[PDB]
C-alpha cells in the first residue's frame, strides 16, 4: 500500500526527553510520539504529511530525523486535512483533539477516516463530530490507533484499533478499519481490533487503573465463590455497585469528593476482614497505599465536598430509557450527557 | 435505652466456623454473625427476638449461648416483627432479604425502623418496599447496619449506619436513624453514619473491591499529576470511563464477559509501560495476577459472550433524563431499573 496519511501533532519532546527521561528510563531514541509514529509509516512507505503548528516543539536535530523519514512537515491543519485517507490526531488533550477534528473534518477527502490515539475514546469523538457526521460527511469514519506505550520507545509493540462498538455501532467502515489496521501492521507493529466503546480503556494511560480494579473484581471473584460460596449473581451486583458508586462520586465530586464519601479509614477497616486466601497482593497493596495517603491530599480530601450522586443500574437505566422515550431520542440523551462530560 | 430489638437470621454457622475458619484466624467463639448480634444487643440491656426458621442451623450447644443471653427464639418471623422498634436483616444471603421485609412491613410496630445488615443496599431495599413505605406505612423508616467484620470476631469494633442519601433523601427520620447508632453501640461498639447510597460499597464483603479499585484509581491520579503532569480534568474523565466501562461490562455480561471485552494480555502489555514510580505495588500485584489466571476461569472467559453495552456518563445521564421527561417520571425509571438489576 502507498496510503496517503496525516498525522496532527508532533508530540512534546521536553516531556519525553527532558522532563521524563524516556531515553534512559525506556529506551529508544527521540524523537517520541506522533512525529515517531509519522517517522515509522513514512519508512513503511506511506505518503506522509505531519502538521505541527509549532516548530519549536523539538530542536533542529530532531525535525531533521522527521525530514530525512521523507515526511512532508506542514503549519497548516487545513493542508494536511486535504492531502490523507487517513487521519491520526497525536493532540494534546482536551479542545486540541476537538478542535483539530472540528478542525479538518470539512477538508478531509470523501471516504476519510479519522483516528484518535491517547486523549479522548473513539466513541466521544464521534459524538463531537455527530452533528456533522449524521449529515454532510456520512462518509467519513471515525475509529482510533491507541499505541499502549510512547511511540519510539521499545515497550511499543502494538497499537489498538477501535472497531464496531459492543452495542453494535459502527464508527467506521470496514473498508477504513482494514486501513488502520493496514497502517499499524505496515510499521511492523501488531494491531488488535477492539470494540470502540472500550478501546481507550484497554490502552490509553487510565489502563493503570483498569488493570488494578480488574485484579480486585477477580480477586473478590475467586474469595467469592470458592470460599465464602456466595452464589455469583450476588457477586457480580456487588462489583457493579462498587464500581458504578465509585465512577459516579467521581463524576460528580472529583477523586478527593469521591474519596471523601468512600472514607479510607473505614474501607481499610472493612477490607481487612476480607484478607483470606493465601496471597492476595492486590489487596495487601492496597491497605498500604490507603493507610499511608498523601499529607496534601488527606488535606484535599477533607475540603471537599460531597455532591448529589444518584445511585443507578446503568445498563438497566439505558435499556429503560429506550423503551420510555423510544430508541432514537434515548440514543439522542445518550450522546448528548456523554458529550458534556466528555467533552465540554 | 433498653429497645424492643428482632433479628433474623442466626447466621450460617457452618460458614463461619468450617468455610471462614473464623475461631482460628479471626478470633473469638460461636456463635458468629446474626445470633451474635442478638447476644451482644441483649447483653447490653435490651429485649430481644431473633426469629430463625431453621433450628438445624446450629448445634443445641451453640443455641444455649444464645437462650443464655436471655434471647428469645421464634421461628416466625410475623411474630418477631410485632416485638421491636427495630428490625435488624441477617441475610448475607440473596433475595430472602426482600422476602423477609415484604413479610414483616405490613406487622411491625409504628415507627419501626428496618436495617439490613449485609450484601442488599438500604437503598434497593427501600425501592422493593416503596410501594407500601409511600402509602400504608409511611412511618416504616429503612437504613442499614453493616458490621465492619463478622460479629464475633476481635475484629469486628464498628457499624456503618446508612443515613440521608448524597442526593438529600431521607429513608428514615434523624430520630429512626439515631435509635439505629445507639443500637448498633452495644457491646462497645463504633457507630458512624454514611449516606445510604454508599454505605454498602464502604462496609460489605464488596469493600474489597472498593478499596484495591481505589488503590489503583490513587496510583494514576499520582502520577498523572506528580510525574507526567496530566491535567486533573482528563485523568478524571479516564478514571469514569474506566470505572463506568467495567460496572457496565459486568452487568450486561457477567464477570467472564468482561473480562473478555477488556483482554487481560492486552491489559499487561499497556499498563506494564506505566511502571512509572519508586513504589507502585498495586501496579506490580495486578500485573502478576492478571498474568497468571485461573485455568478454569480462563476457558470460562473464552466461552463468554460480550453482550450489547452502551457507553454512557451516567450522572450526566440521568440530569439529561430528569430534562427531557422530568423529575418523577426519571425517578420512576431509575427506580425500576435499580430493582431489575438489584432485585428482580
Redo the contacts between chains.
Sequence with gaps: DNMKVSVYGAGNQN?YIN??NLPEK?GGEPPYGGSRMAIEFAEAGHDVVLAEPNKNIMSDDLWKKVEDAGVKVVSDDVEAAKHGEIHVLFTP??KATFRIAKTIIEHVPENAVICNTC?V?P?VLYYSLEPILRTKRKDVGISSM?P???PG?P????Y?IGGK????KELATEEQIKKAVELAKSAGKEA?V??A??S?????????????????????????RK??????????????????????????S??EG??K????E?????????K?LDRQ??????????QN??ET?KAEVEKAE????????????????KT??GGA?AEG??K???R???EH
Design positions: 516531556l522532563k521524563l525506556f488533550f482536551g486523549t475514546s466513541v491507541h499502549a506505550a510512547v520507545t515497550q511499543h509493540g502494538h489498538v462498538t459492543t452495542d453494535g488488535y477492539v470494540p466503546d472500550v481507550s480503556v484497554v490502552a490509553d494511560m487510565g489502563s493503570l487503573v483498569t488493570a488494578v480494579a480488574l485484579s480486585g473484581v477477580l480477586d473478590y471473584y475467586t474469595v467469592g470460599i465464602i460460596n456466595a452464589p455469583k449473581k450476588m457477586i457480580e451486583q456487588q462489583v457493579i455497585m462498587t464500581l458504578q458508586t465509585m465512577a459516579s462520586l467521581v463524576e460528580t472529583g477523586i469521591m474519596v464519601a468512600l472514607n479510607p473505614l474501607l481499610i477497616r472493612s477490607a481487612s476482614s476480607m483470606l497482593k492486590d489487596l495487601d497493596a492496597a491497605l498500604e497505599i490507603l495517603l498523601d491530599l460531597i455532591k448529589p450522586t444518584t445511585l443507578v443500574a446503568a445498563q438497566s437505566l439505558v435499556k429503560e430509557i420510555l422515550i431520542a440523551a445518550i448528548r450527557s456523554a458534556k462530560l466528555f
